[PDB]
Design a protein around this ligand. Structure first.
Ligand SMILES: O=C(Cc1ccc(O)cc1)Nc1ncc(-c2ccc(O)cc2)nc1Cc1ccccc1
Ligand SMILES: [Cl-]
Ligand code: NA
Length: 185
């Protein structure tokens, strides 16, 4: 995977501004850990019918990821501060990768996989995509699967999902471009 960072790249900034606007529910230019974790647990995990343990595992992953960006409960954050937080998460994750230590994004994927499953199906991904709202388009979910290296059953394994997302969120890896079809730039 690309390990070199590209944090000044306008396309990398744009990718995060897209995600930030997506989590900015009321469109006030701020996001909060409170609304995000509520979305993870009270909404996504509820509709997926995750077990209480599966919900909690998913919840602690979401918390760790956004706390990695400097976020905490009861505090609003604007995009530039979030972005610098995300640069700090990104380097922490890449150092973990470089040490053969599990990343937060790997752990979150394990939590997602646990709800469904060592692989997930196109229909299962489509469910997360639509329910989380990251990728409501069936065709974009289908594009994710066309993009990724799948097993002989056409299913997605956790290591492939991990390396794609490490490249997509952290390093603007050209191999990761197109991961969400048109759903996320
Ligand atoms: O989309 C997921 C689920 C997932 C997918 C692949 C993977 O390897 C691991 C996990 N997680 C995710 N992973 C990363 C981001 C994300 C990335 C960049 C950014 O600036 C903001 C959010 N968003 C999300 C969606 C989300 C869900 C619940 C609450 C908030 C957000
Ligand atoms: Cl909000
Ligand atoms: Na907001």
């Amino acid at each position: 995977v690309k390990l070199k960072t590209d944090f000044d790249n306008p396309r990398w900034i744009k990718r995060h501004k897209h995600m930030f606007d997506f989590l900015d529910i009321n469109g006030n230019g701020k996001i909060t850990l409170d609304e995000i974790v509520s979305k993870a647990s009270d909404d996504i995990c509820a509709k997926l019918e995750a077990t209480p343990e599966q919900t909690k595992r998913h919840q602690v992953c979401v918390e760790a990821f956004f706390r990695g960006c400097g976020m905490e409960y009861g505090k609003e954050i604007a995009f530039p501060q979030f972005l610098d937080g995300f640069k700090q998460l990104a380097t922490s994750e890449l150092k973990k990768w470089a040490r053969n230590e599990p990343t937060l994004i790997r752990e979150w994927g394990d939590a997602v996989f646990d709800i469904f499953d060592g692989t997930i199906t196109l229909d299962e991904w489509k469910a997360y995509g639509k329910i989380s709202g990251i990728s409501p388009s069936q065709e974009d979910c289908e594009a994710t699967f066309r993009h990724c290296d799948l097993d002989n059953s056409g299913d997605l394994d956790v290591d492939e999902m991990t390396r794609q997302h490490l490249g997509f969120w952290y390093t603007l890896d050209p191999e990761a471009d197109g991961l969400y079809g048109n759903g996320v730039p």
